[PDB]
């Protein structure tokens, strides 16, 4: 009656890693980190139907911030049944209440990431399969599994370790250096079908995607995916960069002990006939007709002279190799950094996953 479990089969850093992306502390910190009251709203309580009943809340609540005084439910009253919903800490005083279209998308924001550690949460639930087997896998082997995702470590001697390295380096910041720790390369099974579809549609680039280290384990189980409710300077779809430095901002630090650990992917995006722009647009769900991307170019650009390329499935793939220099073209654009845009998920393909300190 005494199950056995079964000797770990990953090696220390991917251990670290499956820790790291499933740990409950991890998810408590990004839920206090966004005002979360998390005694409030414990994370075995977190439902797909409180978080829906979340959004309809701020629907609600933008159908008034739009509509010129329609004469319905104040903000204030509104918001008070936000919070109610998913509940809020601020010391134990009144929440605040959501009055700009600023504050709106944060809770949007907050609304998706907290719904992807649901979806984390969900993805460890004991089955049944798992029950009747007499010798169940390391829970560390487990969790791994549940991921339906290769995770393969790579090494000094890879061909592309000394090319994303590289890539890190010359487009990250000068100063605050971020520092290489792993490389795994990921194999999103699931994503290889949907990708064979734009095998004709070159102009392929690596590109970076920061993230937060609460969402990762979603990110690698269902890849990336344009939701509902974001928003941002370019508009709804996926956003990459190709200067490190700019998606490192969006890297949630965590702390251990004395370090404080980081995950970006590189992806694969299938950029085709490019639309560049210099200003803001947050209304764009689709590139103009005849392009498959937008590109807002930012007034630098990674020396475009000192590209390279990898062969990724039989594919010549992008990658910048350069510090950024400025684009006189773009001196007086918006964006300081590009942003590289997508509008259907089938454009883009996890090809790697990385640690930073
Ligand atoms: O990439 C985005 C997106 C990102 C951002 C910010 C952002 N996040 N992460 C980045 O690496 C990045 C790079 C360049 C520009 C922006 C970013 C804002 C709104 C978004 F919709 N997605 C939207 C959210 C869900 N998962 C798929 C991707």
Redesign the pocket.
């Known amino acids: 009656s005494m199950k056995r479990v079964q000797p770990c089969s990953l090696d220390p850093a991917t251990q670290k890693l499956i820790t790291n992306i499933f740990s409950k502390e991890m998810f408590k910190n990004t839920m206090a980190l966004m005002d979360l009251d998390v005694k409030k709203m414990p994370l075995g309580k977190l439902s797909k139907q409180q978080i829906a009943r979340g959004f309809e809340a701020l629907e609600a609540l933008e159908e008034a911030l739009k509509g010129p005084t329609d004469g319905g439910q104040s903000l204030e009253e509104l918001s008070s049944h936000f919070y109610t919903v998913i509940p809020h800490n601020f010391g134990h005083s009144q929440p605040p209440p959501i009055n700009s279209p600023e504050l709106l998308q944060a809770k949007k ?1 907050m609304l ?1 990431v907290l719904a ?1 550690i649901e979806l984390a949460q969900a993805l460890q639930a004991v089955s049944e399969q798992e029950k009747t087997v007499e010798e169940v896998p390391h829970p560390l082997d487990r969790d791994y599994q549940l991921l339906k995702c290769q995770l393969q470590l790579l090494d000094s001697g890879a061909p592309e370790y000394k090319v994303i390295q590289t890539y890190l380096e010359q487009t990250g910041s000068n100063h605050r250096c971020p520092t290489l720790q792993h490389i795994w390369k990921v194999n999103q099974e699931g994503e290889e079908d949907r990708f064979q579809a734009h095998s004709k549609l070159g102009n392929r680039k690596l ?5 937060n280290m609460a ?1 990762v384990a979603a ?1 690698l189980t269902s890849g ?4 509902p409710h ?5 508009g ?6 190709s200067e490190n430095s ?6 949630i630090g965590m702390k251990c002990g004395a370090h404080h650990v980081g995950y ?2 590189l992806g694969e995006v299938a950029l085709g006939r490019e639309h560049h722009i210099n200003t803001d647009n947050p209304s764009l769900k689709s590139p103009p007709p005849g392009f498959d991307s937008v590109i ?1 170019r930012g007034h630098t650009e990674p020396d475009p002279t000192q590209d390279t390329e990898l062969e990724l499935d039989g594919q010549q793939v992008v990658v910048p190799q350069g510090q950024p220099v400025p684009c006189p073209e773009f001196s007086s654009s918006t964006f300081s ?4 845009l997508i509008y259907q998920e089938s454009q883009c393909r996890l090809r790697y996953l990385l640690e930073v300190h």
Do not use: C, N, P
């Not at 590109?207 to 993230?211: D, P, Q, S």
């Not at 990336?224 to 939701?227: G, K, Q, T």
């Not at 950094?337 to 590289?340: I, V």
């Open positions: 924001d998706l992807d590109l970076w995607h920061g993230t969402v990110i990336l995916r344009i939701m974001s928003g941002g300077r370019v709804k779809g996926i956003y990459f960069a700019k998606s490192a901002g969006y890297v970006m992917f807002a950094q590009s942003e590289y």
